[PDB]
């Protein structure tokens, strides 16, 4: 197919390349230390007035 003929001469011929596909995707972000005070935003003792 790559030589465009049905008969190929003696020799060694380059063809489609070899490629090791990735096994899977891995993601690594560091630890979490500070988070927004949702306990003071949504869990307030008494909500403000309109």
């Amino acid at each position, epitope marked *: 197919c790559t030589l465009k003929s049905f008969t190929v001469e003696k020799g060694i011929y380059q063809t489609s390349n070899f490629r090791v596909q990735p096994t899977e995707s891995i993601v690594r972000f560091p630890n979490i230390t500070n988070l927004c005070p949702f306990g003071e935003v949504f869990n307030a003792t*008494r909500f403000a007035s309109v």
Partner: nanobody
Amino acid sequence: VQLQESGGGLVQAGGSLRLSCVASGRTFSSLNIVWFRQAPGKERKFVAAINDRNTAYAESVKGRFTISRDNAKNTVHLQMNSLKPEDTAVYYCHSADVNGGMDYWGKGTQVTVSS
């Protein structure tokens, strides 16, 4: 816990009263105060909110009410002038930071204006 309340009492017209609202803590310079009053048998209405260093009063309390704060002793003094019988109400004072948190409920003192 709660907010300590004082300054209430039963007085006749033309007298002088000074309500007090003190909130314990260590960040008084960032505290904001919202006031309310609840008349017996009537609706409870907002009185005066002194936030940062700004002051304001409602229709029936403007000029009559002279709100003030004491940064030295965490004290809020409200000078009372021009007593009116219809203003007999229980005043609930509120203390909070700029966020609106640290919400403590004031018990409220009995204030009466005699006709």
